[PDB]
């Protein structure tokens, strides 16, 4: 029966796509330490300028 | 915040050294005033011993 076979193929592609999305987003969660540093450097530079003004 | 506390402490130490020196200028002035009274007294006595009446 081709109708069920084609449906099973689409259901398999659907199960693959959600599983790949889970893996991609889990890798994005690990990137937080890379994206964080530019904000940390801006806070350091802001506090340096504030300290030099107070001096 | 530690760097800020360090400059604030240095400012307070500088304010303290300024006040401490200020009071030593005032104190040293009091002693110089009395010193110049004692200088003038010693000069005036050296004049008094020229009067042979009071010097006798």
SSE topology sketch:
The structure is cut from a larger assembly and holds chains A (55 residues) and B (56 residues).
Chain A: H1 2-30, H2 32-54
Chain B: H1 2-48, H2 52-55
Provide a descriptive summary of the structure in words.
This is part of a larger assembly, with chains A (55 residues) and B (56 residues). Chain A has 55 residues and is mostly helical. Chain A is built from two helices and no strands. Chain B has helices at 2-48, 52-55. Chain B has two helices and no strands. Chains A and B meet through loops of A and helix 1 of B. It is classed as proton transport. The entry lists the keywords V-ATPase, Complex, Membrane protein, proton transport.
Summarize the structure.
The structure is cut from a larger assembly and holds chains A (55 residues) and B (56 residues). Chain A is an all-alpha fold. Chain A has helices at residues 2-30, 32-54.
Oligomer: part of a larger assembly
- Indicate the structural class of chain B: mainly alpha
Radius of gyration of chain A, whole Å: 24 Å
Q: If interface size is counted as residues with C-beta under 8 Å from the partner's C-beta, which chains form the largest one?
A: A-B, 3 and 3 residues
Over all CA atoms, what is the radius of gyration of chain B? 24 Å
Class inferred from helices and paired strands of chain A = mainly alpha
Order of helix and strand elements from N to C terminus of chain A? HH
Tell how many strands the DSSP assignment of chain A holds. Answer: 0
By DSSP, the count of extended strands of chain B is 0
Q: Give the overall shape of chain B, derived from the CA principal axes.
A: rod-shaped
What proportion strand of chain A?
A: under 5%
Distance between the terminal alpha carbons of chain A, to the nearest Å? 82 Å
Instruction: Tell me the β content of chain B.
Output: under 5%
The helicity of chain A comes to over 70%
Coiled coil (chain A): 4-53
Family (chain A): Belongs to the V-ATPase G subunit family.
GO molecular function, one term (chain A): ATPase binding
Keywords (chain A): Coiled coil, Hydrogen ion transport, Ion transport, Transport
